[PDB]
Design a protein around this ligand. Sequence first.
Ligand SMILES: [Mg+2]
Lengths: 147, 734
Amino acid sequence: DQLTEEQIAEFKEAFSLFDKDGDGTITTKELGTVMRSLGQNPTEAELQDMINEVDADGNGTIDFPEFLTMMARKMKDTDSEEEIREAFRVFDKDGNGYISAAELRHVMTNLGEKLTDEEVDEMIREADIDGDGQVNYEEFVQMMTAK
Amino acid sequence: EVKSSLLDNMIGVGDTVLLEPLNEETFIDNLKKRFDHNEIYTYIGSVVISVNPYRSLPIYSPEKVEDYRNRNFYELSPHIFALSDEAYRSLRDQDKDQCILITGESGAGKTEASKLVMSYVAAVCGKGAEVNQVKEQLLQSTPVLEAFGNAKTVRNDNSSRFGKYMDIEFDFKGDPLGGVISNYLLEKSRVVKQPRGERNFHVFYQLLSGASEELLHKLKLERDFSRYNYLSLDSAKVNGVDDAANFRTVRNAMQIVGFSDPEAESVLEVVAAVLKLGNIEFKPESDESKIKDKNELKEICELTSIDQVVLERAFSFRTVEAKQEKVSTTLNVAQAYYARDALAKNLYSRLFSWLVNRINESIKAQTKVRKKVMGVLDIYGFEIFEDNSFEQFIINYCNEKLQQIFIELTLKEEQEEYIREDIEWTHIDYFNNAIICDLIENNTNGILAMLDEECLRPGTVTDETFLEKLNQVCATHQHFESRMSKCRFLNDTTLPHSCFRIQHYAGKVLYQVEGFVDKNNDLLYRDLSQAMWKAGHALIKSLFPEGNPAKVNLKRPPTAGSQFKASVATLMKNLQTKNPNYIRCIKPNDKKAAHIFSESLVCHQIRYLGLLENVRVRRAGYAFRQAYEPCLERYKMLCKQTWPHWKGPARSGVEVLFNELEIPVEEYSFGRSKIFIRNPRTLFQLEDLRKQRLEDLATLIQKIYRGWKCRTHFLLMKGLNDIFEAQKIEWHED
Ligand SMILES: [Mg+2]
């Protein structure tokens, strides 16, 4: 395995924070949450793949070394700030760097692996700093990619 | 910079130039698809096709005007406002006269398109009451001109038998000065004869249906269609048409546009006179024509205060020109009937002109100040009936002329673009309207010229001698056919006698020669005009100013053919000295139903309008073209290099994107400022790829959001974990 010792410890801390039962495992339903908590950004499809591989024995549970196997896959991957930025600019018909919550709702609720109604509800509020004059996605992305 | 495109959320093909493969079935299906989704507008490049919805679509709002105003043609989905925005801005910024030509089958849809244009312009020019006063006059006078200029044919219950131009005029500052209505090509022959199954102009039926008993008594009219030779009982009823109610609607429009009650009444007295003239008959004497019964003539002359002795002599004697010893030529019976008819139809067409002139008075510019105009030209649609006569010939000829200059100009402009972009021209095969026009209008050997020559020659003349003359002179023409002219064993039904066929841009048309000679006779000679001028009836007197002794007599045109030909030239001049745009109107069914779509009828109309030839000449070599920068912008997410911010110059990026998508270098060409794509397949492959990639970009954003959300909350828990782990544990103690 290629993970460094510091990574292993960092992932271990998060793995345990979602190990409610203390049996040294976590549920398949919590897999994405733990991955996202550690700063990885998996799609719902990719998530389904990883579960399909580990739950091919029908248990619904994941232990730490197979979790490390899961975390290792997307390790070298990266999405730039500009990619996420330009991806926003594509759904913006002006060049203003602004997009309407109505339009944003449209894209999130209809395109791709769709955001749920409660999720798209929550997204607007974080995105609408100067509430409720619509979202300056440049700032929203700036905050979102803030590391 | 705006990234909106007609390509976005496009229902079927929004611009027919992108239809592939191009045929009638795909054209018609496309129009049906869009119509079925409430899209009544579809492009052919800049040309707008409009299918009548037969219901009020909420798509003409101030908000919709705000959407299309000052926007590029290709940025929004197809709408008439795009065309009217284009025309308004050319007027405003270039000080160019605009003429928007509207072709196709007459009805409520064509009238509405014209009203939409004028109303968009009034709204957008921001001149308020001055511009709306002109606009109102143009619009409210429409039912008046319909009553006098429209008729039920075998194909259309409310068909325009004339061409109409309307404009709003401005000074170069943009201040409204006025406006005008101009009529052309009024089908005078319908006044005195109608084919079986057809009516005379509406107003005659409206008058006998809706006038009170007292009014009809004052007009010396009997309330009975069988009493008037000029009207048939047989076709007098049009289904779903209440002529009485329409009468009241026409009288009310008259008042609205400023006619006084005495004027309105005067107008109806002229209509009555026209109608009564049709009952005059003639018999030979030993002096070879005499009126059979003087009763209609008497009543006409009392109605109009015309000298009965003089009018009667006018039908039977013609004053020959000085300076010979003979002063009066005796008219025979046939000549007397021609006279009766010439008087009726000219009294009628002059009434029609008078109406237009009256309406024009209140919107007359009355300043010699140079002006720029926003015009709409409405020309009657192509006609291919079971029986095609003189009437269809003139209409089709006019449509042929227009298609000619249109196709020529579209071809010439596509070429000028290709050159500016350094793109190779490929010869386009297209129907040659020019030679058809030449067959019809050539002064030395054309059909109209031969008809004239036949009508004026001193021998015995019939529709047959006319046909025989065409067979002699026009047989050399590739596109003229008749039984005795030609031909190749190609399964053609044999042509009957007494007809000729013409290959028009809209298809072959078979013309029956029956009545051609009669209908070409249109001689209103001086004795008639002078009898009219001396009428105590003010309107009628005014209708024949050449009859005033104070006005010097000129040579009178003896035939209709030559006048119609000059009138076609006039309207063409009007069009060609202005900047043109085009609305092609289509009826989706004949039941006037809101969703019902008949692909059969639309197919005929597609042919009448010459749309397929428009598509081919307009598409030309390359269906699509676009400036490099906006093109790259729209498709840069396709290859994973241009994404998210390159390559180099917009042109470079285009090349590399196409190379990486494995698009063969024969499917496109590099213009001086634009990429040029040959086939709509290429364009749509790009579009399907983009639509997939937008689904990916959505996921990119969505995964980044779900990720940032959990990450933030996790960092919160981590920050407070000391407190959380201290509260799970006791206060005290050992
Ligand atoms: Mg005179």
